[PDB]
CSV table of C-alpha atoms and ligand atoms in Angstrom, one decimal:
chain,number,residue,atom,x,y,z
A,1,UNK,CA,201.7,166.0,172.3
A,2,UNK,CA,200.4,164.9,175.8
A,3,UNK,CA,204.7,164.3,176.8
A,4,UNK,CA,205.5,167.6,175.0
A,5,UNK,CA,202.9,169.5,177.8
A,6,UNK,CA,204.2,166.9,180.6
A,7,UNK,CA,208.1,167.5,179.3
A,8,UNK,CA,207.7,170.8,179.4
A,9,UNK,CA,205.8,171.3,182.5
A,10,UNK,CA,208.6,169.4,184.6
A,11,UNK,CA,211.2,171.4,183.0
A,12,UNK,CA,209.0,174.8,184.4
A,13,UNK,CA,209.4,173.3,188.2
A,14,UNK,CA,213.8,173.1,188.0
A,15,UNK,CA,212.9,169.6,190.3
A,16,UNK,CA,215.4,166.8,190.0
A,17,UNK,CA,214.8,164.4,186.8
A,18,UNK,CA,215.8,160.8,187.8
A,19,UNK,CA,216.2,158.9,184.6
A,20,UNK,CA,216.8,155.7,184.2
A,21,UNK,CA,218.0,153.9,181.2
A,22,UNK,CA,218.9,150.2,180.8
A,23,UNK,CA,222.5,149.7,180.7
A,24,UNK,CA,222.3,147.0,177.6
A,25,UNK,CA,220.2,149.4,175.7
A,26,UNK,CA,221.4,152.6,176.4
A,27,UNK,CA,220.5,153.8,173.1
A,28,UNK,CA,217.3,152.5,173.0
A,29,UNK,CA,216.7,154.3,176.4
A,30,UNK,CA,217.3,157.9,175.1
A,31,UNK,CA,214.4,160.3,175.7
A,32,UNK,CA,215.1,162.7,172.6
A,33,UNK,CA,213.4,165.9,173.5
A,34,UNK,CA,214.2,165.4,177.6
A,35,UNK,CA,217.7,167.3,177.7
A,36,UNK,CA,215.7,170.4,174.9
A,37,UNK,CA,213.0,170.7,178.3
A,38,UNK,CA,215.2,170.0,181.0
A,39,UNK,CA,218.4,171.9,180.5
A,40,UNK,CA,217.5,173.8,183.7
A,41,UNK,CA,216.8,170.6,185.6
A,42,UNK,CA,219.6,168.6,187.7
A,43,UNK,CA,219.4,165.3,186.5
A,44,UNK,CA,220.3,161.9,188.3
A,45,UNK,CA,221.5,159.5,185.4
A,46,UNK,CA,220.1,155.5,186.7
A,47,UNK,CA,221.0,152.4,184.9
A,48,UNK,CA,218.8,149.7,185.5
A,49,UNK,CA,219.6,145.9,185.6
A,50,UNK,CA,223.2,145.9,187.2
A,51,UNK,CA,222.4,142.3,187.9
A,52,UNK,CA,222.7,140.8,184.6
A,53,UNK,CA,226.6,141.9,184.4
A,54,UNK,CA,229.0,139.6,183.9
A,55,UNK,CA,231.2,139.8,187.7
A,56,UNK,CA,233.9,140.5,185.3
A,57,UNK,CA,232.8,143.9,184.8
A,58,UNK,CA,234.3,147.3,186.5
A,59,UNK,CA,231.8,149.2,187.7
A,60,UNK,CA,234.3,152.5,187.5
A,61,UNK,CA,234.5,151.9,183.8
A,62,UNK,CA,230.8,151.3,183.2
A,63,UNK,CA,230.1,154.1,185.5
A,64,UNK,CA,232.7,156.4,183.4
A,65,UNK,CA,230.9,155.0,179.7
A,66,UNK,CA,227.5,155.9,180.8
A,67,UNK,CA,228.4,159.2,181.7
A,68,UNK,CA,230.8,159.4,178.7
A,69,UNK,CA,227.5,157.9,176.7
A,70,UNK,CA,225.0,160.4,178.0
A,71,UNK,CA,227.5,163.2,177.9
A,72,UNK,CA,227.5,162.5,173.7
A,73,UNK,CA,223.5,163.1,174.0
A,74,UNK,CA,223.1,166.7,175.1
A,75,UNK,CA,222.3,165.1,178.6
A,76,UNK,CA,224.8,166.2,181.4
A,77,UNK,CA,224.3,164.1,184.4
A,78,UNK,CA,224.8,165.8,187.8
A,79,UNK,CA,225.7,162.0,189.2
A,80,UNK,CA,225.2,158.2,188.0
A,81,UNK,CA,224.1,155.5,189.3
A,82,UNK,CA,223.8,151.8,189.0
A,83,UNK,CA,221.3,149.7,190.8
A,84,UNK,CA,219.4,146.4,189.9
A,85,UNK,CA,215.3,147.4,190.7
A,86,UNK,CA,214.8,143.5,190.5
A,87,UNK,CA,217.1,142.1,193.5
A,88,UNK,CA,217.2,145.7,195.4
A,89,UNK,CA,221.1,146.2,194.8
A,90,UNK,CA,222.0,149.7,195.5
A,91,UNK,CA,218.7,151.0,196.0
A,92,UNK,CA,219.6,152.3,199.3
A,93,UNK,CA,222.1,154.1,197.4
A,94,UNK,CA,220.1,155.8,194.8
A,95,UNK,CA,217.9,157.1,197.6
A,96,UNK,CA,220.5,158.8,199.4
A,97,UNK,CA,221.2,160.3,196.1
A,98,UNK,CA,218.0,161.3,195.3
A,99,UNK,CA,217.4,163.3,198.7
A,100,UNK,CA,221.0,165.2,198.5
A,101,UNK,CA,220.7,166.1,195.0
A,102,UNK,CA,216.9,167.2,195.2
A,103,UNK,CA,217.6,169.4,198.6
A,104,UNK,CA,213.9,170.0,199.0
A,105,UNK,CA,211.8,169.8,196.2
A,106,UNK,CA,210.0,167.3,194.7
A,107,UNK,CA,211.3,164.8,192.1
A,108,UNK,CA,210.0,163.4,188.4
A,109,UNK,CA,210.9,159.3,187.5
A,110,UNK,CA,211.6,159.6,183.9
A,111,UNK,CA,212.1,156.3,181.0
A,112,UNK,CA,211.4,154.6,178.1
A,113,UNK,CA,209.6,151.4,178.3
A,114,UNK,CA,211.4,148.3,179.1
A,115,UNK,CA,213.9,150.1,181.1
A,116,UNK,CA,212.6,149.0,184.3
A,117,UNK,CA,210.9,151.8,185.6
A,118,UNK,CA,207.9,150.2,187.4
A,119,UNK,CA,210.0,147.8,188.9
A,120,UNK,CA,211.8,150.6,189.9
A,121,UNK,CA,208.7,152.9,191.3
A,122,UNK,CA,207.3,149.4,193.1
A,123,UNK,CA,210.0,149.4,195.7
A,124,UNK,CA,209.8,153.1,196.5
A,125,UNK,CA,206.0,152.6,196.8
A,126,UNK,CA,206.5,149.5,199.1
A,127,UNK,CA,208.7,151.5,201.2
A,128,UNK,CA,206.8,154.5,201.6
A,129,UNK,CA,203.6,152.7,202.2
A,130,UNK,CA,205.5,151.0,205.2
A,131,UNK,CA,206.1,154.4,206.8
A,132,UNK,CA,202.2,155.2,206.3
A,133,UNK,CA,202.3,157.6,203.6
A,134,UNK,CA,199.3,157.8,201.3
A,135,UNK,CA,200.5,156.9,197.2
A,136,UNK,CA,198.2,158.2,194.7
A,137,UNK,CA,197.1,157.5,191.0
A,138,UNK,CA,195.8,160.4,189.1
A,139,UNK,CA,196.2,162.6,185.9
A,140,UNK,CA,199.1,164.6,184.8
A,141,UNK,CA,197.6,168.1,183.6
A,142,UNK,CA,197.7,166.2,180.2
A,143,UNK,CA,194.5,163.4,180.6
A,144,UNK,CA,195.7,160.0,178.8
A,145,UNK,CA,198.8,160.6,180.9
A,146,UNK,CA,198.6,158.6,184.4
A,147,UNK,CA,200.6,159.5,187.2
A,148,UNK,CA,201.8,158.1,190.7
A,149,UNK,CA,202.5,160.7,193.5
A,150,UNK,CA,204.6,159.3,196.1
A,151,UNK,CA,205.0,161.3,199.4
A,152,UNK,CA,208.4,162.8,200.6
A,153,UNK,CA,208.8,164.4,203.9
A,154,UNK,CA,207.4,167.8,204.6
A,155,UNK,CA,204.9,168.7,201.5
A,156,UNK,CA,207.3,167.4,198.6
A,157,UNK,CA,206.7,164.6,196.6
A,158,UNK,CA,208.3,162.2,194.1
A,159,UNK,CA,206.2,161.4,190.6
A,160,UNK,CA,206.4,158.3,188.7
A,161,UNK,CA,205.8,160.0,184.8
A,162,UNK,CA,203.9,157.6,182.1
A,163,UNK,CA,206.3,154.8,181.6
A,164,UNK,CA,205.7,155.0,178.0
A,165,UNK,CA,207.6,156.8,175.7
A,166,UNK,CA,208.4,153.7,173.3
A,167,UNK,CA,211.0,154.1,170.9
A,168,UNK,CA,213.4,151.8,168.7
A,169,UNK,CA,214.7,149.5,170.7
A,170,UNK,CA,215.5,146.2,169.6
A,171,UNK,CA,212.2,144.9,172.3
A,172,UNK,CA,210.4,146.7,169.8
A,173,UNK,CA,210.9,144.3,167.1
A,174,UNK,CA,211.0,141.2,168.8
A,175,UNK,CA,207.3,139.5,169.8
A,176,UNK,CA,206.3,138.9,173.5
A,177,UNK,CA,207.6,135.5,174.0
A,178,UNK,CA,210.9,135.8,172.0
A,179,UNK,CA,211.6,138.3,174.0
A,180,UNK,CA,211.9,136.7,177.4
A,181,UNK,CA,214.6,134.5,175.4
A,182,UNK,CA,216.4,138.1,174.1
A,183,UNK,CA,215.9,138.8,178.3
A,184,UNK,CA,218.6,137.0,180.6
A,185,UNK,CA,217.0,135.1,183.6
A,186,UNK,CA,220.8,135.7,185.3
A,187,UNK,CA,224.2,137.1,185.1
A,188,UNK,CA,225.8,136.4,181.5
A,189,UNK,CA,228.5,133.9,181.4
A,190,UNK,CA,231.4,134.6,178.6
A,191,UNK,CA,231.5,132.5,175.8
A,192,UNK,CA,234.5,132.7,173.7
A,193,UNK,CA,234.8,132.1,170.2
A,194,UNK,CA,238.5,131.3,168.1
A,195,UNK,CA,237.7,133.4,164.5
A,196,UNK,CA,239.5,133.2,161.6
A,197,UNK,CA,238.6,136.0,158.4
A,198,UNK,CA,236.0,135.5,156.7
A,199,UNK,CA,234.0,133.9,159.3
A,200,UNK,CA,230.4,134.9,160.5
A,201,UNK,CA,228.5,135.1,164.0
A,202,UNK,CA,224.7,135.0,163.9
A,203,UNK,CA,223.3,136.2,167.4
A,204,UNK,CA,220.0,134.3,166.6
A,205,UNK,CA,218.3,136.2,163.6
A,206,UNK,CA,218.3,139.8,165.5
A,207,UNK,CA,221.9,140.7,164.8
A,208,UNK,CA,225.2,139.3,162.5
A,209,UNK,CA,229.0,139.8,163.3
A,210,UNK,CA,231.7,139.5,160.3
A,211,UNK,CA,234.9,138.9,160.7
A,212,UNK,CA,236.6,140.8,157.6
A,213,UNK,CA,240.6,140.4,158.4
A,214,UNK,CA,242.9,140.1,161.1
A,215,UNK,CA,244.3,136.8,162.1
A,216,UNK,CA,243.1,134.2,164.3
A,217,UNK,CA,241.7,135.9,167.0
A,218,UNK,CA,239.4,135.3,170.3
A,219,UNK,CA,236.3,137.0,170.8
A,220,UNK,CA,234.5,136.9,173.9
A,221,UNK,CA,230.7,137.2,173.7
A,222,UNK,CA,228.6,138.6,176.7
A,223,UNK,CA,225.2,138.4,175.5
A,224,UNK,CA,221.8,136.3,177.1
A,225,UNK,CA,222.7,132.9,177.4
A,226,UNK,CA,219.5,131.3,176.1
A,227,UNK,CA,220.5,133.2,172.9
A,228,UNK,CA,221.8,130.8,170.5
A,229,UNK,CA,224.6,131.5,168.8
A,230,UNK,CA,225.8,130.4,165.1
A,231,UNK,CA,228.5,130.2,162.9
A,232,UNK,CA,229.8,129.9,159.5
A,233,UNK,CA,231.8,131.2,157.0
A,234,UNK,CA,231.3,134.6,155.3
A,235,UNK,CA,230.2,133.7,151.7
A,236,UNK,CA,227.3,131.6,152.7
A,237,UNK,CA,225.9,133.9,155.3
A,238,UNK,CA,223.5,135.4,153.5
A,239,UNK,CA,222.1,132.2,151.7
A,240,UNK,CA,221.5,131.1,155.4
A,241,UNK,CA,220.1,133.9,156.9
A,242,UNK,CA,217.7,133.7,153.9
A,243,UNK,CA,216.9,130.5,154.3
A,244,UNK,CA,217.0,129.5,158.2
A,245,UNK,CA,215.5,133.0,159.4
A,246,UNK,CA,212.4,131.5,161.7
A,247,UNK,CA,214.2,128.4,161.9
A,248,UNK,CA,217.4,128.3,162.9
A,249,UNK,CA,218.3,131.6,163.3
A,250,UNK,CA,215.4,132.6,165.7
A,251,UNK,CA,214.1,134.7,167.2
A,252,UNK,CA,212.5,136.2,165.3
A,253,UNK,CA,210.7,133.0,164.9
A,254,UNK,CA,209.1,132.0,161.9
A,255,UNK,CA,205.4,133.0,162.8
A,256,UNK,CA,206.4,136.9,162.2
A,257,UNK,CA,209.6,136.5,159.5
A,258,UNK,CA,207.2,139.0,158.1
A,259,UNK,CA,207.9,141.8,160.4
A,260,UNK,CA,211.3,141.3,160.9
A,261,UNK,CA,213.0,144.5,159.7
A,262,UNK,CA,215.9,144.0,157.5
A,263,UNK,CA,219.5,143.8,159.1
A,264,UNK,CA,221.2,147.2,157.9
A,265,UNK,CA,225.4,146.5,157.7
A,266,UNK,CA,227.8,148.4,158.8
A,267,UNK,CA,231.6,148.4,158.7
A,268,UNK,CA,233.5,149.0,161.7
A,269,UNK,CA,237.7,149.1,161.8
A,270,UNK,CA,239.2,148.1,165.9
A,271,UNK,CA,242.1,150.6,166.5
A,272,UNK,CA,242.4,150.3,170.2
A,273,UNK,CA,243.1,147.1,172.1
A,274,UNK,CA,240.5,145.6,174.7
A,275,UNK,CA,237.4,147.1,173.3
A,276,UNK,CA,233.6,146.0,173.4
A,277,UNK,CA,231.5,145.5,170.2
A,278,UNK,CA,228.2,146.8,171.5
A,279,UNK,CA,225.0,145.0,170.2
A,280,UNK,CA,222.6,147.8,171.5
A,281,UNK,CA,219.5,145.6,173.7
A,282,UNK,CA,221.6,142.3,173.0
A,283,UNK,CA,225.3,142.7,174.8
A,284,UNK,CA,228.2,143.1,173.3
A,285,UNK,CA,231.5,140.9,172.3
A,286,UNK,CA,235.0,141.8,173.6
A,287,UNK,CA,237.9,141.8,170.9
A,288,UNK,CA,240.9,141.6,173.2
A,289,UNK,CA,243.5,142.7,170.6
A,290,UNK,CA,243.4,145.6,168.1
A,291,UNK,CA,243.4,145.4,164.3
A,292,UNK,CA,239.7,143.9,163.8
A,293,UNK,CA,238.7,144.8,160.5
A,294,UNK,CA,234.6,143.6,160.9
A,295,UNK,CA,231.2,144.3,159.4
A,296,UNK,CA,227.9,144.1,161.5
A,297,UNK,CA,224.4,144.1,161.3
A,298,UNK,CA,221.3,144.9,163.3
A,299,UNK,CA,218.0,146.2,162.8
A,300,UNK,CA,218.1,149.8,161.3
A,301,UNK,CA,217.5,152.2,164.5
A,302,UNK,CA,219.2,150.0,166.8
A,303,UNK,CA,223.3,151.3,167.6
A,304,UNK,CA,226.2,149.1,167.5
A,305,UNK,CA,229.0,150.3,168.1
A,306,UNK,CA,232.9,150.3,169.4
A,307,UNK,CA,233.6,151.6,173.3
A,308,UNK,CA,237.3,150.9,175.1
A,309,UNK,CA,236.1,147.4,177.3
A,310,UNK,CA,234.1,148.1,180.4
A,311,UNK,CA,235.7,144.1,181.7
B,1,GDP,N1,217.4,141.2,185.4
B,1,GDP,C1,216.7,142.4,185.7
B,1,GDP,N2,215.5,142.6,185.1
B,1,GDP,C2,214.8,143.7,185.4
B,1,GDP,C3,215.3,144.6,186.3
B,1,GDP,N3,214.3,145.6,186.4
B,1,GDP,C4,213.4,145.3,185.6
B,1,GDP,N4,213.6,144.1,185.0
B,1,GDP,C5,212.7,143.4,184.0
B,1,GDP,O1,211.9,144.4,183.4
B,1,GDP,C6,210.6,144.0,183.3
B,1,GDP,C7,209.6,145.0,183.8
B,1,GDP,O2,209.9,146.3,183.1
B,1,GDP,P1,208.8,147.3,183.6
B,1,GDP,O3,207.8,146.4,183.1
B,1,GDP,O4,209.5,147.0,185.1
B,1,GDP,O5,209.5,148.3,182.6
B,1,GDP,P2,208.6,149.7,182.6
B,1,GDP,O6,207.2,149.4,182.1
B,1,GDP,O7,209.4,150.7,181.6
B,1,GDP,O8,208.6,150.3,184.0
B,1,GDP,C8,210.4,142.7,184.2
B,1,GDP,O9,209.7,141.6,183.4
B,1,GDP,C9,211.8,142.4,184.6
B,1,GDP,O10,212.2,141.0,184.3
B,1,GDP,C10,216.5,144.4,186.9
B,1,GDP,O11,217.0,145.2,187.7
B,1,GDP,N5,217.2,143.3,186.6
């Protein structure tokens, strides 16, 4: 109830709410209960980790999905923006953003974990520590609650909130050390795959793709490229998944098979042509022709779901 008093108190001051979300887990960057406090607050929409996308990608369409996927929420974006807090791509960007849109007041970091928020904060704190300003560490009127106060010109001040605020994303149920596999070192390379019906895609053990009907087709997957990828046909996927969970199909690996929440299936009909299969934390695998008849699964909690092709 610590966030409630903090989400509330931020939504008293009307100061600019910079959120930022990751881009590959936009679901599982949602702050359910931010856009219920902060209707009266402008807030500058940031996705984090702009680096990892394929060159392939539009950065209009993305830009126009977010907005289009935070618009869905109840959150209503006054602008979007896409930077990479890791290699310092359009940073200087963001900035300029966050000075026109906050006119004069101060300014409140908001995200999940595992969005890239600290990164984030870090080069805003190596910045204004080069221009001699003083950053400090103390409580949010809350107590457990930490939080960095960054100077601003002229008595305002940005504030980096509790980076916490875990939810369901699928980092959550994947261990430290499977999850720097689930994490791309670089931008993902495509990797096409020829299906027939009744074939199956296992994205390691964390997520499944089924190809009901439709005709040889070609679907393009852009997901971390240390994630290995399997496949074989329909009727036998479940006596493998049952079997090679741990083992083959890892992560998860086979140390916590006994955490691993079951894969919850879901059925999914392609209309439109050039659309993206999103795998929620994972990627996301383009089906360049419409008819797809499929069936996928994923961890209950975390979204997959169809969206018109941001390549
Ligand atoms: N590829 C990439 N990785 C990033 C980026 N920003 C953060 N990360 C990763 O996110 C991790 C840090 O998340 P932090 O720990 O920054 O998340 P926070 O605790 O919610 O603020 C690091 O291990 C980075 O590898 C980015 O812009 N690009």
């Amino acid at each position: 109830d610590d966030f409630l008093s903090m989400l509330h108190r931020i939504g008293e001051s009307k100061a600019l709410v910079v959120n930022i979300v990751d881009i590959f887990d936009f679901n599982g960057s949602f702050i359910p209960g931010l856009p219920r406090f902060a209707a009266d607050n402008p807030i500058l929409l940031v996705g984090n980790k702009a680096d990892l996308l394929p060159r392939s990608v539009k950065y209009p369409k993305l830009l126009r999905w977010m907005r289009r996927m935070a618009e869905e929420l109840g959150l209503c974006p006054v602008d979007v923006c896409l930077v990479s807090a890791a290699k310092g791509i359009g940073m200087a960007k963001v900035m300029e953003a966050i000075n026109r849109y906050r006119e004069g007041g101060d300014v409140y970091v908001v995200g999940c974990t595992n969005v890239g928020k600290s990164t984030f904060i870090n080069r805003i704190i190596e910045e204004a520590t080069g221009k001699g300003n003083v950053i400090t560490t103390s409580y949010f009127p809350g107590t457990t609650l930490d939080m960095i106060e960054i100077p601003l010109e002229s008595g305002a001040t940005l504030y980096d909130t509790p980076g916490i605020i875990n939810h369901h994303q699928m980092a959550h149920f994947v261990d430290a050390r499977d999850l720097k596999i689930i994490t791309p070192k670089r931008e993902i390379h495509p990797r096409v795959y020829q299906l027939n019906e009744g074939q199956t895609l296992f994205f390691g053990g964390l997520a499944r793709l089924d190809y009901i009907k439709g005709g040889r087709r070609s679907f393009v997957c852009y997901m971390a490229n240390e994630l290995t990828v399997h496949r074989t046909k329909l009727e036998k996927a479940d006596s493998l998944y049952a079997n090679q969970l741990g083992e083959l199909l890892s992560p998860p690996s086979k140390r916590y098979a006994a955490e691993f929440p079951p894969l919850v299936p879901r059925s999914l009909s392609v209309k439109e042509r050039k659309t993206d299969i999103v795998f929620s934390g994972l990627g996301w695998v383009t089906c360049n022709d419409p008819g797809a008849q499929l069936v996928v699964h994923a961890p209950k909690g975390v979204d997959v779901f169809i969206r018109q092709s941001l390549i």
